Amino acid sequence: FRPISVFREANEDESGFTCCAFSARERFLMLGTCTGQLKLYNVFSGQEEASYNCHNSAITHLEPSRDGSLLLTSATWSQPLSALWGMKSVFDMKHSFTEDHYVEFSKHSQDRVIGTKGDIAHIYDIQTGNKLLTLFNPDLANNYKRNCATFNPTDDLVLNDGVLWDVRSALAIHKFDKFNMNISGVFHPNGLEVIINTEIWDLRTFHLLHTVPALDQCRVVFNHTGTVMYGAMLQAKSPFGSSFRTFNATDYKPIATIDVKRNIFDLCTDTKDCYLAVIENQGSMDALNMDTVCRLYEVG
Ligand SMILES: CC(=O)N1CCN(c2ccc3c(NCCN)nc(C4(c5ccc(Cl)cc5)CCCCC4)nc3c2)CC1
Ligand SMILES: CC(=O)N1CCN(c2ccc3c(NCCN)nc(C4(c5ccc(Cl)cc5)CCCCC4)nc3c2)CC1
């Protein structure tokens, strides 16, 4: 991990980056802010290139479509809470997800959005904005406090609140046992494994393949090649602490623990997996304003 760049939000007494994701274009990071702005930055110079007010509360999440034409945002305390924006020609809102605190694109063909509202998953059509499905079963719910519903790599399975759903049949296939209070889990990019906190489950057998203690209370993200998995741990103002963990995605063997000594808001990689961008808070929770920086590392 060689530090390559650092910048803060342009012209602010206090810097309000809350989340990031690379665009299509390679040198250009997208960042959310505590004032609900979406901003485009040159990741090397720290130059602010553009600015849009998406919400009147802080941004928690953003996701660009692979084709560069669409963006998902989620906010903290806004109605609507999440939205889908078009980025071809004119930046404009296409649809809004009134009470979904989290949204993602479908993964194989990006024609759908999945939203989370507490313990409930919603799937929408991107073209119409219509709600196609509601995935919830009160008898099977885990009530994870940081539930985030997600599609698998082929878009035909969903994980919501520790329940595996078949999308075609809208049937719950399997409820995974509850072993923690917060983390609901993600699919491995290989399409065969599910990672729920410290447990790695085989999707074909539901056997336990690995325990990874260092993953406790981590939000897990994969690089674009699916070779490396990155975790930041929930704190006991940011949702994360000051360290991130990397693991070999194939054998789950720890690669590195990096303590940046500042609470982390987000991290992401470019599509070529050369760079890791981390949002780090220089201020404490108790500060009047936030004071985040975006730090860019070359991976080593
Ligand atoms: C030299 C070079 O490659 N560059 C040089 C700098 N670039 C720039 C410079 C200005 C941009 C701009 N503003 C021009 C007038 N509002 N708008 C947008 C769009 C946009 C994206 C995000 C946000 Cl938050 C607000 C607007 C995305 C594409 C079309 C719809 C607006 N993208 C730009 C990219 C990116 C790449
Ligand atoms: C009140 C306020 O202004 N703030 C300032 C803004 N805060 C922030 C800033 C960054 C966040 C973040 N980044 C990483 C992803 N982009 N992820 C998440 C979510 C999250 C958190 C923990 C876990 Cl295990 C699972 C999910 C995931 C996205 C939606 C909501 C919960 N929450 C954030 C809230 C919340 C408090």
Side-chain angles (χ1 to χ4, degrees), residues 1-10 12 15-87 89-300:
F1 288 106
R2 192 168 59 100
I4 269 294
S5 206
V6 64
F7 51 102
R8 36 188 289 132
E9 188 185 8
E12 303 314 77
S15 178
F17 306 147
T18 51
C19 60
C20 55
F22 282 94
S23 65
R25 308 139 151 293
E26 308 220 297
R27 299 211 125 131
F28 295 97
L29 188 68
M30 299 171 102
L31 298 110
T33 78
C34 67
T35 56
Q37 302 183 301
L38 172 83
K39 290 189 167 196
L40 197 67
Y41 274 80
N42 191 305
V43 87
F44 295 106
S45 66
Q47 171 73 274
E48 184 175 298
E49 299 290 339
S51 205
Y52 200 90
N53 186 51
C54 288
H55 307 277
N56 292 330
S57 69
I59 313 293
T60 61
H61 191 60
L62 70 81
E63 193 195 347
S65 71
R66 292 198 293 274
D67 63 7
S69 72
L70 296 168
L71 179 78
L72 285 167
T73 61
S74 303
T76 297
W77 201 249
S78 285
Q79 194 289 295
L81 197 57
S82 289
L84 178 66
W85 311 83
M87 301 199 294
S89 305
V90 174
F91 194 98
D92 77 315
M93 203 189 206
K94 316 265 82 156
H95 303 301
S96 78
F97 315 99
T98 188
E99 283 194 273
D100 299 358
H101 67 79
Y102 182 74
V103 286
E104 321 195 317
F105 287 119
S106 53
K107 285 170 153 98
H108 181 50
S109 165
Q110 297 193 308
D111 57 1
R112 286 157 171 199
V113 177
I114 183 160
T116 312
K117 174 189 159 165
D119 288 332
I120 306 177
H122 295 138
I123 293 156
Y124 309 88
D125 183 57
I126 284 171
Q127 260 190 57
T128 55
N130 294 343
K131 190 186 276 168
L132 298 181
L133 265 197
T134 303
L135 302 183
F136 180 63
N137 189 324
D139 299 341
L140 292 186
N142 281 316
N143 309 118
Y144 283 124
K145 300 178 170 152
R146 294 309 190 145
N147 184 38
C148 294
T150 178
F151 279 112
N152 78 331
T154 49
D155 297 341
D156 58 5
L157 299 176
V158 161
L159 210 46
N160 179 62
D161 199 27
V163 186
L164 184 68
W165 293 81
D166 183 274
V167 169
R168 207 172 312 84
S169 93
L171 266 191
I173 300 302
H174 188 67
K175 167 188 182 318
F176 289 100
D177 283 321
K178 197 194 183 158
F179 290 124
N180 91 289
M181 292 301 285
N182 296 314
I183 306 303
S184 58
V186 299
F187 292 102
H188 197 286
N190 64 24
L192 299 185
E193 296 165 359
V194 142
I195 298 100
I196 306 182
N197 199 47
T198 52
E199 288 62 69
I200 315 309
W201 303 109
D202 192 299
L203 269 181
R204 300 156 308 171
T205 64
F206 299 127
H207 289 186
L208 184 64
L209 289 180
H210 309 277
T211 301
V212 187
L215 277 185
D216 198 12
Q217 302 305 295
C218 297
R219 185 179 187 274
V220 168
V221 163
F222 292 84
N223 63 354
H224 286 80
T225 61
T227 54
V228 177
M229 161 178 60
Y230 289 83
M233 180 185 199
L234 282 184
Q235 309 207 237
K237 180 57 196 220
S238 185
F240 318 99
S242 67
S243 87
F244 70 84
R245 330 192 159 64
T246 63
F247 311 80
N248 179 304
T250 301
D251 53 6
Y252 296 97
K253 272 246 127 45
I255 297 169
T257 298
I258 307 293
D259 186 1
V260 296
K261 265 171 202 205
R262 290 172 290 285
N263 293 316
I264 291 161
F265 272 82
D266 206 1
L267 55 78
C268 66
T269 74
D270 71 309
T271 53
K272 303 203 143 232
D273 288 346
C274 289
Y275 299 126
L276 177 78
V278 188
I279 309 300
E280 304 180 9
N281 194 13
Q282 298 196 98
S284 72
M285 335 183 96
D286 305 342
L288 271 205
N289 19 109
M290 259 175 85
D291 192 27
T292 53
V293 303
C294 182
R295 263 164 84 99
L296 191 72
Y297 305 84
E298 187 182 297
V299 306

